[PDB]
Amino acid sequence: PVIKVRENEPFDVALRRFKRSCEKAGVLAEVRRREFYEKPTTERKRAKASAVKRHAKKLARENARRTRLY
Template structure:
């Protein structure tokens, strides 16, 4: 759990913003949303496999875009 020390003469809004940023980096909000309802182990595996497949397809498409030969001048 991220913690924030409010500095001397620091407005509360800035400290709150730092706390929110720390929570976002730690992934607390996404974790609580994911754990809000029970997810069956098979559904969890299915979701993870789908995410891995999507990542792989995206990586392959990015690699093919990068490896196009440069245009030749005539």
């Protein structure tokens, strides 16, 4: 996330840009992930579980949507 302040650019704006860049990188997230050792099994489980959740969100909810709430 290397950044250079442009000529006649505000500080705040620059900071914001930097933040955005960082977010894009996913650096903080990566750091968080590597704080502690995740057993392979655990890693697998999370990934599959997450996937399942995503699938549920996509399809079941869509089905629900077809019918009106009131």
